[PDB]
Structure formats: structure tokens, C-alpha cells
Amino acid sequence: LAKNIVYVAQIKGQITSYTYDQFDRYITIAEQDNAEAIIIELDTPGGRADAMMNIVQRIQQSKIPVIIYVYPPGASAASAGTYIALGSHLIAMAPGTSIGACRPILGYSQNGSIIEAPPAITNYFIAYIKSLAQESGRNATIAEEFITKDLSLTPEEALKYGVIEVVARDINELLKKSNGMKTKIPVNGRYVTLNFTNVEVRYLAPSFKDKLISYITDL
Amino acid sequence: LAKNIVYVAQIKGQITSYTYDQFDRYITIAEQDNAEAIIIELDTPGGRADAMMNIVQRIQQSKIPVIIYVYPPGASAASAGTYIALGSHLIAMAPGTSIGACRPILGYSQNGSIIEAPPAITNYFIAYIKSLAQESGRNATIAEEFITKDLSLTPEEALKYGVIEVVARDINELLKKSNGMKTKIPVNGRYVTLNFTNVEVRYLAPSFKDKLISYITDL
């Protein structure tokens, strides 16, 4: 009961209804355990708007800070993952990762051709991404460009442009660097200073169902 | 005189990429065997827009008639399933089935809440559903109300309002009533008259992949 605990979970693949369930399960565990924070190792190439928005909401309502960590090297928080990142308490990126490319689409044709959205729905997602960025005090100009210019950024760029808060090679470096940082959004109405000194790190294993469903969506 | 081959497949659940794959698989089989028609027993609460549009497109390119049959009693062709129906060569409904209810949403939220579709999306689907209805000679006025009023219809209502062509209790009655009917859209440029005198009914089983995905879904 007098411990400082950080949970670490892993989220990989397309952001779908089932990804929501994962976020909710992992965050719920950390809440009920009174965790100082939960770190989510995120690697997503794309996903659905509705699940994305539900995840952002769940993060907004989280009773503990949610740290989105684009990890491992080569991971991306592209498309829906970028919104999830921008909607969270702190963003970290591992060397060799990517953030951005958030243009909304209606989806994919038989060809594999891109089915673009009506111009006005592009403007809707622009408003939404700008909102997330300004609510978390992050660069809404660059965030807008994730859509309008299909802009994608490396860790160092994302940092320099004030889109993320941390560049870190692993969990331990993440903890060391983010220690003492204020969350970019509130936790239960208050901005919170992260206390990662003397912390116990607990890894949450993805379940059989997580790995299987991810693998199936993969193909 | 001649022996006419009719294929019958089942397509159930949310409309997704795997559903497109089912439509493509079952239609290809019927095409290669020079079928008179493929009947699809459709039961769907909704699904994804891009897959729906890909399915409508696959049906347009079909070298044989595709009959959408809302079956069994209690089934519906709601939301995305309505567009598939309207995009097909003939629509049948079993007693006690539903069609319509197509008001687009961005999706559902955590607590029963519904994320609203921006007006552009709404207008975009109004134009699309009206178009499908116009192209197939079906009631475009009523088709719009599937969206603007979330209108849902019984089979008897659907026929009376000129949205569908046939009310039938089983495959037997369907062939009997639809025999001699002209398709509502062309097959390769011409409007085919359906010949169901001397018919061999062939049922297509879902594949291993089909069954696995749906069993996961049933949990």
C-alpha cells in the first residue's frame, strides 16, 4: 500500500474496437492498483477513428497518468496512434521511431487504392487534432500538418517542434527523464508531477487473445 | 429446357474486409460455373463503409446476378447491409426481417453514447444511397429516409414502397416468385431475365477462415 508502481503494457497493430478493450483493461489494472503511471509501448501503422476517439476519451478519464511510448525502435504511432499520443499525459519516442501521417480516409478500394474523405471531414479531423494538441499544450501547427502535409517526424524533430516530451531508448531511461515532469493534461482535474524515484516496474503480458487477434488482423 | 445452376451462400455479422472476401469468394465460384444466379442469405447489423462500398463494387462487376436475401426470419440488412441490398440485382426478404436504419455515425462511445457524424458524411451517404436506389429503380425517396429518419421497414412495407422485389419464406419460394423477373441492375451491360425453370440449388459452405473469424466474434 506504500509503494510507487509503474505499469508497462504493450499495444501493437491496427487500432480497432479490440484495441480499446486492451487500453481499458491495462489502464483499469493500473488504476485499481493506485499506480503512479502506466506506460504504453505503442506500435501502430493505422486504425479506426471511432476506436481512436474512445481510447483518447478513456485516457482523458484515466485516474492515473497514461504515458504513450512509441517503442520498440522502428515502431510508429502513425494514423490513429498519433491522436492517441496527442490525447495523452506524456509522449515518449524511442530512437528510430515515427509519429504523424494522420490524414483521414474513407478507406481502401479493391485495388488497394486510397479512398479519400470529403474535404469537410478532413477539416473535422484537423479541428479534432488541433484540439488535442492545444488541450495538452503541444504544437497544433505541426499537428495540423500531420494531416494536411501527411507530415511524419523522427523523435528529435518531434521533440524540437514541441509535439512530444521525451526521447528514450528504454523504460528505465524513460522513467529517469520523465521523472519530475508535469503531465500535459490533468489527472482528475489536477496537473500532476510524475514521481518515478524508488519505483517498482510491473510488466503486463499481452494475453493469448491479444496476440492472436493482432496476428489475424495483421494478414 | 436447360438446367439452371443457382448458388446459395450465407453472410452474417458485421460488414468488414473478411465479409468482402466472402462476397468475392462465393461470387467467383458462381461465375466460373456459369451460374444463373447466386443468392446470398444476408444477416447484418452494420459494419464498415469501405468494405460495404467494395462489396457494392464487386456486385456491379459480377458476371452473374447477385440476389440479396434477408434471411432467416429475425435477420436484418441494417446500416451497411442496406447499401449492399440496394446495390444488388434483386432483393428478397423473409417474413419477420428488417431493412433500413442507415444514419451514419462516427461510432459508439464507452457509455452507450454515440459519436455524431459531421453533416458532410451524412450528405455524402444520402447522395450515395439515392444513387444506388436510382441506378436500380428502387424508391430513392424512401432510401433517403433510411438515413434522415433512421427508417426501418418490414418486408411487406419494403415491397409496397418499391425498395425490394420479392417476399419469400425460403429458397423454394424465392426462385418461384423471382423466376421471370428482370434484374434491377445490368449484368455486363444488359438487364438479364432470370430463368429459374429447371433449377439445381447448390449451397456453399463457409471456409475454415470464415468459421474461425465468426467463432471469435461470437465471444
Partner: peptide, 8 residues
């Protein structure tokens, strides 16, 4: 490339 739509 966020995919936008479903329907009820």
C-alpha cells in the same frame, strides 16, 4: 490514414 466510418 485514419479510417473514418461505420453506421448504425
Amino acid at each position: 490514414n485514419v479510417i473514418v466510418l461505420m453506421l448504425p
